[PDB]
């Protein structure tokens, strides 16, 4: 199934792009293609990593999210970037953790734990989300654009520093070849993807928010980290947990700060400004994760809980 | 005392209703009557339950709340329904748990624990409250009524499913007779109670919110679960805790979803839309409960803490 | 260094006040002086305390905060009072705990714990902050001034009662002499400090909020409790933790209620009304504290986390 979706994806995505027919179906072709490419992009990142390993983990483990957002910045579609960063933490904490706890929840009794790590990894989540996303949002309302992105830059610079500082202290040959392949393919698909967003909104009626928080996030970040759902089935939950939380952590502490600083160069800037639904969805998820990482790691319904929360948010983001 | 308040209550409530004198005192007569009826309604529900036991626990354990809200929907007084559902979680988490921890707090040393269950029961509370009440509220502001109650219906359908799924997996003869008696009596009292609400507001100056969140909630849900305060005195705290949290859980996951779906039939619908004070009171209580269920189960001041929070909210709901 | 800042401070503060030159530099002279005086005020409070000990701990341990706010009330500058009470919990939870966890974080392995106390002290924090500061704020929007300060008075009266009730149940000669000295000196410096606030705002461009939440709070409360940073270095973390959380607790439960009731006498009243940034900064800090008090008590980066949160808030309060 993984090979088929790539082998069909790229050709179709080339021909559709060349023919320019039509604006609607091109979206559907792009999204499915990148899903397949993203898993392979995650497997290559994983296999390469199995000191500098953490850097490639934060860079290439979130690469499609970085890539899609990069071209979104060129088109000035800064809302979608924020939407996708919102949706990347949602997916990690509620979908790729939810499906790991549900699908891997056939073992039934309990699940692999490192209580020390789970309780420490919530300690950073709160810091990452409940401060460094909440604080800029609420402080920014009556700030003015200059001070807005200065605070963003301020938070962004310290979040990468505090992420990289802890990181500094605390087959293999095909990995680089396939990673170099998938990247460029994705990049070229992503460039044309950004131009599709305005038509999809009008023709379907969907809000650009829905597209960003859900469609772009599932395809991009969530697919890259779908290795955790498989890892949960092979009774290695503590890594499936480690992947979900860790990825979210680097999205909040590295990826989002990366985007904010780099957005200042072209054309011009995006501050860490999240809508109310986007913000409260993120904290609720974080709280629900701390409330689920504490207890038994998993159960079928415990994963169903995390999933129930997601679909609700998703349909809420659809209905706005 | 329990027999007297029923024996005086019903007759008085019949004569006052027939005489139609006056609109003000009828309220006072109704409320006191139902208090007495509700404890007996809780005792019958308990005795009947001591697989299907969980259904009658969620149905008849919250029956007066369902009954008062049912006729409130017929009068179109949808605000009071939301107010009473707000006040049912408040009472459970802060009053009937607060008085269990205070009155039963004469033991002094510690109190009956099941740390596994308390930590798991917070995990669902957050899901139930901090997502499935918060998310609909904040997402709904700029949604439009169609999408509003569609999201409500959406959340409602999955919350009952997720509640009933876990429930499916995981003297006695007088119980049904007294339960069948109390129900009908309550129902007929409740029908006439709803019509009293508009006059009480005007003549006293009270907001309909105050009446719903406090007066209706204490009389209805809190009285039904007052068995926990007695159970705490008999040094069985872990059931007094189990009652408070469990009841709140089924209010958020079964009762409130029940009301939302059924409200669509007559005349027309109520979405899960809570005011700001109603919403933030509910999360604060939930957080304070997790902060108090973790530590020693009880102490006198630990129960006084939970009670101090309540009276504050109550006078705040009075002063709005 | 401690002697020099007092010995230079008072004289300079006398001469500058007499000469009336200028409005700008007088601020700088006052603030530095009180920093030095406040540590000595904390040492005297500590040495006196090492039943009634808890009263002097809550009174004189927060004395400069009480003193600066007292004269702020006379000038009617009620915003600064709320700003400084906001900043006193911020500092305690993020600065004086952050610097204790960072500077004392050279031990490296772990740090002194009393998990029972830390988990209990969060239980009151949530109550103190997430209810008794949040609830009055959100409930007050559409209340009217009469009901506003009535709710404040209501919350204030029960918070001191609930604080004093638990307290009731549960060199030395120079201490009183130096405490009596520092108080009067501070009081006279503070009186002239309040009059400086309006010019500093205009001439620098700073918001009076920034001054209150940060400048007044660091100088006042944070300096008094800087003993904890030293105590962390002497490998006595559990007292450095006890100081930070305890002080915050008495600020929320005694100091702030003290100010509210006493403010009603002159000239007229201040309700517990906090701006949105002030409120969300306080809960985020509290959450981050619970997320950091749970795990290892300290690590260098764990203290750097708490500090990173602070500077962000601080620059956000600067940029508003």
GROMACS .gro file of N, CA, C and O in nm, chain B residues 75 77 193-203 208 211:
model
   60
  395UNK      N    1  -4.115   2.482   2.811
  395UNK     CA    2  -4.132   2.627   2.825
  395UNK      C    3  -4.031   2.708   2.744
  395UNK      O    4  -4.040   2.830   2.737
  397UNK      N    5  -3.726   2.747   2.817
  397UNK     CA    6  -3.627   2.801   2.910
  397UNK      C    7  -3.497   2.720   2.903
  397UNK      O    8  -3.461   2.649   2.998
  513UNK      N    9  -4.310   2.404   3.858
  513UNK     CA   10  -4.191   2.477   3.902
  513UNK      C   11  -4.140   2.569   3.792
  513UNK      O   12  -4.106   2.685   3.818
  514UNK      N   13  -4.136   2.517   3.669
  514UNK     CA   14  -4.083   2.591   3.554
  514UNK      C   15  -4.157   2.725   3.532
  514UNK      O   16  -4.095   2.826   3.499
  515UNK      N   17  -4.289   2.724   3.554
  515UNK     CA   18  -4.372   2.843   3.536
  515UNK      C   19  -4.349   2.949   3.641
  515UNK      O   20  -4.391   3.064   3.623
  516UNK      N   21  -4.282   2.912   3.750
  516UNK     CA   22  -4.255   3.002   3.863
  516UNK      C   23  -4.132   3.091   3.840
  516UNK      O   24  -4.118   3.197   3.901
  517UNK      N   25  -4.044   3.046   3.750
  517UNK     CA   26  -3.911   3.105   3.734
  517UNK      C   27  -3.909   3.253   3.694
  517UNK      O   28  -3.823   3.328   3.740
  518UNK      N   29  -4.003   3.294   3.609
  518UNK     CA   30  -4.005   3.432   3.560
  518UNK      C   31  -4.048   3.533   3.664
  518UNK      O   32  -3.996   3.644   3.667
  519UNK      N   33  -4.143   3.495   3.749
  519UNK     CA   34  -4.190   3.581   3.858
  519UNK      C   35  -4.086   3.596   3.969
  519UNK      O   36  -4.062   3.707   4.017
  520UNK      N   37  -4.025   3.485   4.010
  520UNK     CA   38  -3.920   3.482   4.112
  520UNK      C   39  -3.807   3.578   4.076
  520UNK      O   40  -3.756   3.651   4.161
  521UNK      N   41  -3.769   3.577   3.948
  521UNK     CA   42  -3.669   3.668   3.895
  521UNK      C   43  -3.709   3.814   3.915
  521UNK      O   44  -3.632   3.893   3.970
  522UNK      N   45  -3.829   3.849   3.874
  522UNK     CA   46  -3.872   3.986   3.884
  522UNK      C   47  -3.895   4.033   4.026
  522UNK      O   48  -3.852   4.139   4.065
  523UNK      N   49  -3.965   3.955   4.105
  523UNK     CA   50  -4.003   3.995   4.240
  523UNK      C   51  -3.885   4.004   4.337
  523UNK      O   52  -3.881   4.095   4.420
  528UNK      N   53  -3.208   3.459   3.641
  528UNK     CA   54  -3.250   3.322   3.610
  528UNK      C   55  -3.131   3.226   3.612
  528UNK      O   56  -3.147   3.106   3.639
  531UNK      N   57  -3.074   3.111   3.980
  531UNK     CA   58  -3.177   3.010   4.006
  531UNK      C   59  -3.137   2.874   3.950
  531UNK      O   60  -3.145   2.773   4.019
   0.00000   0.00000   0.00000
